[PDB]
């Protein structure tokens, strides 16, 4: 189909789950792919399954590694030329309330899914604009960056943060003719191994109370509306909140 | 007309514009009121133009200071009897652009803007629950919560967080029958001594194409609706947002 033909990304997080399958789908519309994660064993593995070198390639890197970034955008440009697209899909999760969440919990959890997704966007637009690359940031968040959950506090602040961070770098980089757009993509539940891993997690994701369809999503389900925002069909979204759940916001 | 009867109010950044307007209209509305503030000498004249101190005392207190916050709620609690009322009103700005942000820049705005209001939260939660007060925290909020500006990209991260933070905080104080509710409050363009230092500034604020009333708000704007919230009137609305912006975000 040859989509995102010509295109080089980075996709943090991208050796499991919603990163793993966004990252084997730019690689099946002819993308180069650098995917990131925190355990090399698991990253070489990831890779390889998906292509060759040449398609795709791993980088150790915990995204709240500011110094890090740097090192991944000249690795990818090494291996694959000038960076196009930046997909800031890593993230973690903390089960408490705000009332429950400790101090050490708040900023473990920001430094990953709010620092280290301003790091990739203010990295990204430096090393993006103005380049004629069609550069495109996807900046992965959440149904939590729309409603609130009781025992997610940290989570939902993170999600919030992103979504209008993001507003703000897509008018910069539009109103700057930077040629690079900013977008968030909200998934609802999404059944990956680590649901799989959680006894009843996926049951109770999918009670109609919380996604109407009664069941959760998978994997290509993000990875299909990334194609959409990393090619060139999306040349005029920026700004945007891209939202695949299920019917969750709707109710 | 006495709408605070009983009341007992924190308000952080209480000694000027905003939060002095709010701390201002809480005492003739008849609550006690602990205005916080960087610098003593500000801090004291304010609570004294204010009222006597069985009305409104001040504290010295940079919100980013977490333990200083346990300080704060035994000094309120001191004064007037049980906290009721938390108007988590502190907060800066940095003039950049995400992609000009400096790390140092956006540390700094995130320890007042984001972790300073979970820090409140958090202990305005654990200290006002189950105790009849008919709570209330107020988590002050802009236009930048809704809406990028392309010149305030660490500020937005920090309003969005906040956002959704607050409905988080709101349904499990609601799901856990906790009499605190948590609500966000959204000011447009507001008059201060600080806008009217600015050459031009409220000139710029006040274009149609920013606020289309042509004229920009006042900060009695902000402690009217600040009244509604921390009143037992408003005891039906929680994880709301609550925007006065000249029709900013309508357009
Ligand atoms: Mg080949
Ligand atoms: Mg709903």
Redesign the interface.
Known sequence: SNRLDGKVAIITGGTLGIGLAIATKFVEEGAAVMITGRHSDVGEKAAKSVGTPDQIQFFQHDSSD?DGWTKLFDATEKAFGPVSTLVNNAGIAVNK???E?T?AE?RKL?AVN??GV?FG??LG??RMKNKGLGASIINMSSI???????????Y??????????????????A??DYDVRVNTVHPGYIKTPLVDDLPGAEEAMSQRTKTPMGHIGEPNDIAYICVYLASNESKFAT?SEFVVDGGYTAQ
């Open positions: 500011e309330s705000v009332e969440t101090t708040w920001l709010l620092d301003f966007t203010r637009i430096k939590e960056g729309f409603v609130g959950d009781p025992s997610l506090g940290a939902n602040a993170s999600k919030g943060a992103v979504r209008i961070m993001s507003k703000s770098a897509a008018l910069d980089c109103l700057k700004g």
